[PDB]
Amino acid sequence: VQFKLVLVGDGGTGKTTFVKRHLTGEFEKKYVATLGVEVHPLVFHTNRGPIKFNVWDTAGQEKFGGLRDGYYIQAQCAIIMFDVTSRVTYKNVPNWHRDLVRVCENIPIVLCGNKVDIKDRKVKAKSIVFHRKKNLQYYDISAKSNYNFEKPFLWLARKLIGDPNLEFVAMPALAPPEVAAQYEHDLEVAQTTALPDEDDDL
Amino acid sequence: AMEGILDFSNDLDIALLDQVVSTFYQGSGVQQKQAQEILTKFQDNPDAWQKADQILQFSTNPQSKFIALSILDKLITRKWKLLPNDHRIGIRNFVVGMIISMCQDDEVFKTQKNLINKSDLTLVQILKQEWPQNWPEFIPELIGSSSSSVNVCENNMIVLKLLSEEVFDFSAEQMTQAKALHLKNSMSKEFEQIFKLCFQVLEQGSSSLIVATLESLLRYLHWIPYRYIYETNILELLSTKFMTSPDTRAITLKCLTEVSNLKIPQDNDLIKRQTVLFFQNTLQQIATSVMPVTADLKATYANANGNDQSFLQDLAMFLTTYLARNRALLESDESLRELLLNAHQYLIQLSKIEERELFKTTLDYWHNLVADLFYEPLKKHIYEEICSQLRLVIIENMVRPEEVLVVENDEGEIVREFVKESDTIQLYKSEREVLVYLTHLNVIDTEEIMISKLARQIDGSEWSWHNINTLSWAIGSISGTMSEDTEKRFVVTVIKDLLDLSVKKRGKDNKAVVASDIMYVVGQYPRFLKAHWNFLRTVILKLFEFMHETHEGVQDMACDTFIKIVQKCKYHFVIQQPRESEPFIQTIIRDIQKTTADLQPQQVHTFYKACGIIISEERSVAERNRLLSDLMQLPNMAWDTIVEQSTANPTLLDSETVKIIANIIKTNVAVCTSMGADFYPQLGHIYYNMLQLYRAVSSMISAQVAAEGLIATKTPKVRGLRTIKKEILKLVETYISKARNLDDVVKVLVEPLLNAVLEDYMNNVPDARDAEVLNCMTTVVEKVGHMIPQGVILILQSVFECTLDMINKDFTEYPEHRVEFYKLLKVINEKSFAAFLELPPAAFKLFVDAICWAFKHNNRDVEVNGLQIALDLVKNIERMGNVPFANEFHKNYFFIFVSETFFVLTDSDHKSGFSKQALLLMKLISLVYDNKISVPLYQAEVPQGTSNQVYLSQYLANMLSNAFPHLTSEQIASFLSALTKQCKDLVVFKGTLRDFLVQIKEVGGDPTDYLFA
Amino acid sequence: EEDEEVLYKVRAKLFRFDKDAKEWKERGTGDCKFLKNKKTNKVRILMRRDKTLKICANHIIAPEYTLKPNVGSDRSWVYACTADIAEGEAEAFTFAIRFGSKENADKFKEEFEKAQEINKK
């Protein structure tokens, strides 16, 4: 049960960072621009079984756009992303939508306002209204603080499978197995490499 | 093996190409990734377009053809006028022919929808270049082709939709003003015939052709004149015929929504009737063909069958758009009274749907309505039953306010919030405002609703955590709506009930929810507390008992409610009340240790802050200083005994002391926040010792780096020591920002401060430097900078060059320093420009480089300041008049500031700051235009008496020629000639700038486009 | 989990150490559990992510492991794991785990050390 998902938005909005968090759990601090598109599989476990997503992480920056709207062909759902700390990225949402819904004529789409964790927010709540007339779900998210980070995928999973009561469920975990020179050197490097974000609550 | 297609010496194997495309779209892993690159490199090939017709023909893969069109699209939008005239006509032909061919094969028309829509867009892109100047018969020959097929007619409607989109909706950014106006006029001139085709198709039909036609209308409605809508039969069709079939139902409702925003006359009774009729019809159809007013729209939306969610969303948009504008047409005629109230009853049902963003759309309307009812006379009684229903909907669906710090978990326990629920902040304000409006419209009904709902919690017939919470929050939200006397009686009963309820319901889960709510209500009603001392006093005492509740959620809210109350009721704590032995602030202080015993450090500081609010009300400078001293009894005795042991020996090297010291300062910052200028005495008590502790701590940090390395800056011990340094700065910043006696700041505080902090910063390694130092200096320069010119120069000398070297390598490292650096420069450039005059030529050059570097940032906090500084600097130099330094500045840096501003405007990476870039460029051009620069900007180089105006043109035309070599000379000539003339009118000027950006993205733009006006 | 007893629950954030690129990387944030199997008397760490409820940790608390401290934290530990079946196949990770407070780090440790004594039997 697998579905093509395209992720579109302006350069720097935190698309690849959003996917990375969902893949591995990491928060990539650095901004390495995506070149064209990156395809990543992403499985969730639900009460209606496992759903799969082919997450096509498309490029935001124009110069690295590659095939552009060619990436959207046969896409069964989508995520449009912008940065609440950048007003220009929200003004561009309709352009991204235009391109997307010209190829993908009928699919569930989530609009997402990233980086809400940042104190000095620019794109105010009230301002966000483009989603309404175009029948898109909206969510405030933060790839950093994990705010509503599950919501885009949970909602898409509900629309694609066709069950509004689709909730995530824990994978019944198997009992783990009962199992030397390099180890000593590798551990030393680890202790002397400081853990990031020491002023977080966790 | 796959890279054969990237070879243009030999032929192109279409079969190989198709394998590469299949591998990308259907494949996976590294095979997918590899093909993906190959396809991109192919697509990006400048000569790739020549392979389009070859691919369009012999390829069987539809995706291969889609990319053929993507390659053409690029060629058409950008390099179209660069092609020979033959290639243009040939490309037009087989694009037109491809569309004919795919439409006349029924098989291909049905299953290859993606490819046709891309073909139709690719056509529209040509039109944008060719039509109607070099294609006058497009529309006439389009309306003719429609008759001879159903596939073609339908596809023509798809083309017209895309054309309308590109001309009216998406032209502002993609075309010049002159070209956008040209195409808009051309569509307007031929729309009389376009509509004739549209109106004909609508009469002769529920099918894919009708849908396609209705989709095009929706785009026309954005711009077409109202007469095409109101002087035809189309409203009747839309409002009745097209609503009864579900496939065309959705698009019609969207068209009618757009019709409800068309520019109409206001004194035309015939159109007023039509506007009532198309609504009346529409609402009748929903009643018969969809669902009645009584239908449970909450349950439907939740079930989510087919497009019921989308539908309900679009209905909500229609009902609120139309009513928002036209509802007054229903309020007066009694035959239309049922239609009015049903339309609203539908909205009431819609407002019950469990879905946030839908609710926000309905709430927007309710606010809009209740606002009008609150004012417009003889109206509210019309909606008495609608409102009465709406009070229930809102009160039963109140979102948790920010103040309530408790929430339920998945196990059934009431735990503290992990983060702030930041998405709902605005929702509450939206709900509050409406509910406040509804309370005023009928206070008796609001009171009766809530009081009864509450009585169904006491008896427990409707008892639940949700039911009690939503009700409690609602009661808090309507605070200050009622009159004081009607409020008193209301709150009285409400509190008694919640107290009565609090006693019976036991357990840490129950009391947690109840207490938090009682805290929210008490805190939201300050006026009641001001009148009722005995009550207020017992509350505050009880709040202090919550500061000993082991449950961390309740405890934290205790502290937040205490300060929230005190912020409003401060006065009743500073004076001695009747029947009281002492002013209560005095009772608070004497047991401050007991009260805050179980509280955490941060919560303790809040407590101290609240006390500072209360003390600041005391105006006798004797008692205020006495109270201040009594308040700081514990943090000063802790302090005094540390300053003894600290001065006795630099070894403080205990992590337990570092935390205690850090807390003595944090407490001072907290009391200083609330007491502002009234904090001075307490500052002086610790000021000299503190600056000595800053010097001592500073050394340990340096000593630990020497002994452990850069890594030590990450250790708990060092971070502890740095926190002390940072917090000390915060205290001096906090006071100075609010200080009233500036003489004392300069003569007492400033010189010891600069000595303690600057050299230390200058002489530490980058990673040990605190950005806070820069922040503290900004606030000092802000307030007393003008009084301490020598001290401002000292600040520059110590931080300017060394900080600049930390940030001039990349745009990412040392982000805090980066930001505060440019704040510091800005305030110096405003308040003490003299310090920059004293900088040597070499140091001033770096300062110029520093500003231009700040343009190139993508961070707004840095970018905004970067342009603002430059603007201020040009004002500063202009201010000096015709002196040598002003001349030397212009000769050195005027063309750097002109050429740098142009790079960031045009590189398509700094569109966020376009406005201020324009403003800055406008100012620089205006200087030459108004002969404000007294000396020649050239140097020998150009003829003797050449004016600066002529030379500015000569430089810019050269700059731009080399920067953008695909533009003609006239394109640049026109651009500048226009741009210079318009140097006084910003809005126009910017239009010319936006025009220029559009032209550099393509080839052979019309130089007459810059004549727009 | 129906055949296991919960010995210790504490909220935590887990990291794994990237070798090739010298840095720590987050693997999850949620409730780290100590689960003793009632049939085999073997204790294990099982930790799921918040909201999505996916396994970021799943290994036996081997008596071989020692909790070393990190240079930058007083509320964290770092140790080697030879077989973690969270992502599926067994794999050797160098984990770091961080907690809310110091007490949460120290309580974890003593329980971890108690867990290893149960496993040796």
Ligand SMILES: Nc1nc2c(ncn2[C@@H]2O[C@H](COP(=O)(O)OP(=O)(O)NP(=O)(O)O)[C@@H](O)[C@H]2O)c(=O)[nH]1
């Ligand atoms: N503060 C904060 N920063 C975030 C958040 N999400 C992403 N970022 C940051 O934003 C920057 C860009 O992230 P990235 O994923 O590259 O965005 P992108 O849309 O994929 N860029 P592109 O489309 O060019 O490939 C990074 O520095 C990243 O750490 C967030 O929730 N909060």
Ligand SMILES: [Cl-]
């Ligand atoms: Cl007061």
Ligand SMILES: [Mg+2]
């Ligand atoms: Mg990316």
